[PDB]
Amino acid sequence: QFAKPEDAVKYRQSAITLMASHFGRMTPVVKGQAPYDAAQIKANVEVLKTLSALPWAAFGPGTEGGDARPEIWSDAASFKQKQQAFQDNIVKLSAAADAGDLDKLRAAFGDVGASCKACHDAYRK
Amino acid sequence: QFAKPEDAVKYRQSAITLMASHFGRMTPVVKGQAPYDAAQIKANVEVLKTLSALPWAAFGPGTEGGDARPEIWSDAASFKQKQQAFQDNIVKLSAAADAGDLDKLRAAFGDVGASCKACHDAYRK
Ligand code: HEC
Ligand code: HEC
């Protein structure tokens, strides 16, 4: 859907910005600094699950740029494993949020965060 | 969820970028230049319906900036009517996509586009 590689870069940066906001805005809740409203979190995590699927389609062939390392394309199977693992932890976070259980939310949140970092360590400049 | 007004600006710009991409990428399909795959479009419009709800919460009080005109805040009821009308046309586009009917999709797409422009005419610098 991108006329030029730069358009894919801008899309994925925007997608990731949104994803990151819907993840990070739960930090005070996980930490207990903000109240836990199970319905609120369930709805937010539903947004996050939609958003978490979007960046990866904007690293298509020929869309090198931004802070994406070239290894994303030359190691496509490994990059896909990092995106898959992240999306699988997002499924776990959805399950926690759907259950309405703060202890499970906290644990699932930390797993997601670790998956963000794991991908960055290998694939973000 | 924004530490500073600029963070709300960046969020809404990213949200709108995503929304705009999921809308605009259907232009070739509407025009008949790309094939019409009803399932493909139904799924894309589901993404668009999630995205289309997100920008407006990032124009909260005190988040003036970017290319948002100040009238968004001093005319809050009118701005809400433009966002509502847009989201109501998004519901119509979802119905069209769910029905699998290209003629209805085309018509609903044009209504959505007109609502984008209508808001810009009043509220985008
Ligand atoms: C690989 C499978 C990743 C996962 C999982 C996550 N991120 Fe990431 N992120 C990745 C890349 C390759 C890039 C650079 C994109 C580019 O082309 O520039 C990023 C970037 C970010 C950014 C900055 C976005 C911007 O506006 O430029 C942030 C804030 C960020 N990533 C956060 C983030 C979070 C919180 C994640 C898990 C919830 C996450 N990312 C996962 C690759 C990957
Ligand atoms: C008001 C209810 C709007 C509707 C409906 C749509 N847009 Fe808009 N848009 C609006 C504002 C106030 C702004 C400026 C935001 C800011 O703070 O800068 C915008 C901006 C855009 C942009 C540029 C985004 C960026 O990256 O800075 C685009 C490409 C854009 N808008 C497109 C767009 C489309 C295609 C819409 C309907 C599908 C649409 N917008 C609706 C306000 C409103």
Q: Could you tell me the distance, in angstroms and rounded to a whole number, from the CA of residue A117 to the centre of ligand 2?
A: 31
Does the Cβ of B86 fall within 6 Å of ligand 2? Answer: yes
Distance CA A40, CA A65 (A): 36
Kindly identify the ligand whose nearest atom is closest to the C-alpha of B60.
2
Name residues whose C-beta falls within 8 Å of residue B40's C-beta, 6 or more positions apart in sequence: none
Does the beta carbon of B15 lie under 8 angstroms from any beta carbon of chain A? yes
User: In one letter, which amino acid is A45?
Assistant: V
Nearest CA to B54 out of A37, A10, A47 is that of: A47
Closest to A21 (Cβ–Cβ): which among B11, B13, B17? B11
Q: Cα–Cα distance between A32 and B112 in angstroms, integer? A: 41
* Separation of alpha carbons B122 and B77, rounded Å: 13
Across the A:B interface, residue pairs with CB atoms under 8 Å apart total 35
**Would the CB of A105 count as within 6 Å of ligand 1?**
no
Q: Is A9 in the pocket of ligand 1 (CB under 6 A)?
A: yes
Contact predicate B86/B120, CB 8 Å: no
* Method by which the model was determined: X-ray
The residue behind tokens 């209805």 is B104
Contact: A15, B18; criterion CB under 8 Å: yes
Looking at the domain that runs over B2-125, which CATH code has it been given? 1.20.120.10
Task: State the CB neighbour count (10 A cutoff) for residue A14.
Answer: 24
CA distance A11 to chain B (A): 6
Orientation angle between helical segments B102-123 and B76-99, nearest 10 degrees: 170
Three-state secondary structure call for residue A53: coil
List the 19-58 stretch of B: residues with Cβ below 8 A of A. Answer: 21, 24-25, 47, 50-51, 54
CB count within 10 Å of CB B110 equals 13
DSSP B9-55: HHHHHHHHHHHHHHHHTTHHHHHTSS---HHHHHHHHHHHHHHHTSG
Q: Which two tokens stand for residue B11?
A: 């969020």
Which ligand has an atom closest to residue B12 CA?
2
DSSP label of A63 = -
3-state secondary structure at position A93 = helix
Give the best residue of B21, B46, B47 to mutate against chain A (max A CB count within 10 A): B21
Q: How far apart are CA A47 and CA A41, in angstroms?
A: 10
Chain centroid offset of residue B80 CA:
13
A120 pocket-lining for ligand 1 (C-beta < 6 Å) = yes
Quote the crossing angle between the two packed helices B38-52 and A38-52, to the nearest 10°.
Answer: 130
Exposure string (b/e) for A29-56, b if CB count within 10 Å is 16 or more? bbeeeeebeeeebbebbebbbbbbebbb
Report the sign of the C-alpha dihedral through residues B75, B76, B80, B81, in that order: negative
**CA separation for the pair A48, A106 (Å, rounded):** 15
Q: After which residues is chain A broken (C to N over 2.5 A)?
A: none
A3 — phi, psi (to 5°)?
-70, -35
**Ligand 2 pocket, mutate which of B54, B90, B124, B125 (most atoms under 8 A from CB):** B124
